[PDB]
Design a protein around this nucleic acid. Sequence first.
DNA 1: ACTTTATGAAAATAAAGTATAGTGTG
Length: 174
Amino acid sequence: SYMVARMQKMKAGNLGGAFKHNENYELTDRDRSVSYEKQIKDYVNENKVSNRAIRKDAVLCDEWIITSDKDFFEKLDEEQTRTFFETAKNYFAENYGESNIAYASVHLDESTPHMHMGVVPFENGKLSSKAMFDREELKHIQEDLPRYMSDHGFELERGKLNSEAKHKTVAEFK
DNA sequence: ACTTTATGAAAATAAAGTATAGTGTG
Ligand SMILES: [Cl-]
Ligand SMILES: [Mg+2]
Ligand code: NA
C-alpha cells in the first residue's frame, strides 16, 4: 500500500462548507461549535506581526487528505486505524506546529477512512501557504512522511518519485 | 515568473496570491 497525502488550499468561503461537511471524529482539542473560518481568523489576527489586514484571497489553511487503499485499512482494527490518523497528525504537528493544526477530522464509514486535516501556514508571525508549502516542502513530505509512518509500525510505500499521474475526481474520472 | 493585494494613500512597494507532490478504485 501507498501513503496517500495531498493538499488543497482553503480560502475564507471554503472553510464554511468544510466545517458543515465535517459535522466523523475530531482529533484536535478545537471547540467543535466554532466554525473553521472564525477559529482560524481569530488565531491569525491575534498573532500576526503585520498590522495590515489578512488579504481577502489569503490561504487560511492547507487542507491535507490522509488515507491509503481500502485493503490497507482492512488489515487494521479500529484502535490501530485511529492510531494511524493520530500518528499522521503528529507528523504535521511536529514539522509545522501544534497550534497550526486547526482541525483533524476522520471519516470512518462506507469507504476507506480518510482524514481531512486543516494546517494553518502560519510561521514567524506571518500567514503564508506560499512560504510553508512550496515545491521542495511537498517533495520532502512525499519522501519523509511514509518513512515516519513505517517507523511507527504502519507499512507504507512512498508514492512514485516524480509520478506523472494527474489528480482525478469521480465526476471527471466519470 | 508573473499577478493580486493592502497600504494615512503610490506617478510604488513588498508579501503573498497562482501550482506544486502524491494515490484512490473496481
Ligand atoms: Cl474567499
Ligand atoms: Mg479496519
Ligand atoms: Na519576469
